[PDB]
Amino acid sequence: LDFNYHRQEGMEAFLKTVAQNYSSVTHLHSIGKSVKGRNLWVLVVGRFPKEHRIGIPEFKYVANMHGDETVGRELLLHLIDYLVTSDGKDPEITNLINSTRIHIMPSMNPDGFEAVKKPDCYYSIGRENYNQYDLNRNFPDAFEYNNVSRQPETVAVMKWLKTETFVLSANLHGGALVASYPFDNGVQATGALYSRSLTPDDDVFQYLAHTYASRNPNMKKGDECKNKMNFPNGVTNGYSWYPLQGGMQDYNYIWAQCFEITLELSCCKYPREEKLPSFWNNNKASLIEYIKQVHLGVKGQVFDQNGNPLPNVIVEVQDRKHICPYRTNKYGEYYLLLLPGSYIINVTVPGHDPHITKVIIPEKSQNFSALKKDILLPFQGPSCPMIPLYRNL
Ligand SMILES: *[C@@H]1O[C@H](CO)[C@@H](O[C@@H]2O[C@H](CO)[C@@H](O)[C@H](O)[C@H]2NC(C)=O)[C@H](O)[C@H]1NC(C)=O
Ligand SMILES: [Zn+2]
Numbered sequence: 260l261d262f263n264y265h266r267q268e269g270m271e272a273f274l275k276t277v278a279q280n281y282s283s284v285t286h287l288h289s290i291g292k293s294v295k296g297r298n299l300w301v302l303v304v305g306r307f308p309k310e311h312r313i314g315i316p317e318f319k320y321v322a323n324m325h326g327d328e329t330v331g332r333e334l335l336l337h338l339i340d341y342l343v344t345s346d347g348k349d350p351e352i353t354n355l356i357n358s359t360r361i362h363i364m365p366s367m368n369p370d371g372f373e374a375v376k377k378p379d380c381y382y383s384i385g386r387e388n389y390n391q392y393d394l395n396r397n398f399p400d401a402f403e404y405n406n407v408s409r410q411p412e413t414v415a416v417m418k419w420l421k422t423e424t425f426v427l428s429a430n431l432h433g434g435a436l437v438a439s440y441p442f443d444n445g446v447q448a449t450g451a452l453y454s455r456s457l458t459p460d461d462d463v464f465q466y467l468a469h470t471y472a473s474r475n476p477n478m479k480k481g482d483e484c485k486n487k488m489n490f491p492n493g494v495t496n497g498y499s500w501y502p503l504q505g506g507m508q509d510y511n512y513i514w515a516q517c518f519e520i521t522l523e524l525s526c527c528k529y530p531r532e533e534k535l536p537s538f539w540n541n542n543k544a545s546l547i548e549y550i551k552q553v554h555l556g557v558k559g560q561v562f563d564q565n566g567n568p569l570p571n572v573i574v575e576v577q578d579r580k581h582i583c584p585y586r587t588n589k590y591g592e593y594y595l596l597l598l599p600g601s602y603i604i605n606v607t608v609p610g611h612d613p614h615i616t617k618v619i620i621p622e623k624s625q626n627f628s629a630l631k632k633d634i635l636l637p638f639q640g641p642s643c644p645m646i647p648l649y650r651n652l
């Protein structure tokens with residue numbers, strides 16, 4: 260692709276075309292429409308695109324939810340191309356594109372983007388959805404009723420997040436240059452008084468933020484954005500930054516069972532075209548190294564003694580119980596991003612004693628797949644109200 264901006268027509272175009280020229284390993288669809296009839300295109304890239312496949316983890320990149328934050332819109336289109344055209348020629352990337360099913364959403368709020376005609380670094384007519392709402396302040400909140408008009412895009416995504424067993428994510432932003440991990444909101448129980456809101460998996464989230472930023476020359480600088488605040492190593496907790504109520508990152512992790520972190524890829528929210536090559540350049544390796552992380556820890560499926568995948572069962576590590584507990588999918592498989600170390604998973608099938616099953620998670624993988632571990636229970640065999648769970652917790 261070319262390195263200029265790609266409003267709706269041309270970006271859409273690109274996509275549809277990538278659709279044709281590479282149908283063997285791509286699939287484009289739409290999880291919904293803006294409040295303006297604009298399309299929420301997603302492009303999946305995988306060995307067998309179009310259908311989740313037991314074993315291969317699902318991965319996404321949502322970007323442009325803030326109208327005016329354009330770098331990510333463009334990085335995702337360009338990431339897209341990279342992958343299709345690297346497929347087959349570059350081995351490592353090919354091994355990856357094989358081993359995973361990558362879904363890309365270049366622009367969750369296109370009405371916002373289109374809206375601005377006079378580009379700018381700190382403010383604009385875009386950002387908010389067409390009803391002036393902040394799409395990253397519009398999701399259910401596990402901390403304090405975010406009673407607000409759920410918007411088309413917000414909803415489209417919620418359902419979409421339901422359509423697949425997404426394992427690892429990251430929604431792109433501009434306006435700062437840092438990688439923010441959860442929770443973006445908090446409670447004393449999580450340590451709001453220390454100006455920090457930690458997750459059961461703060462270590463994997465930290466490792467994940469660092470993964471991405473360590474690979475961004477500037478994001479790594481820490482002392483980078485002028486009119487903005489800066490961070491060390493380019494990573495930070497959401498709360499230690501700014502308690503964010505009703506954000507997608509928190510949602511994905513609470514109710515959607517997947518890990519999302521926020522990538523703040525540019526100081527200047529809507530930079531000049533001439534700068535994209537550089538933006539592509541200072542992010543390339545970071546997008547790839549991040550996606551690649553969808554293979555941390557273990558995965559597998561769970562069956563009863565008649566070798567039948569029991570879905571909806573709870574499978575989580577001994578001391579990592581989630582507010583809304585992680586269950587298996589319709590295929591009874593389970594995915595748990597974890598760091599190198601020895602674990603104990605408690606398989607608790609409804610109305611049963613939790614089943615122990617121990618696993619040592621390697622310490623360097625030679626392939627692009629998590630550790631596989633199937634569970635045979637020695638017997639036989641709705642999510643959570645989207646209401647502030649942690650509050651009264
Ligand atoms: C990665 O997946 C690709 C799928 O495109 C594999 O390559 C193709 O494999 C088919 C087998 O049905 C061959 O007929 C094609 O010639 C291959 N396409 C080309 C030229 O790349 C590839 O072998 C896989 N590599 C792995 C498993 O690492
Ligand atoms: Zn933003």
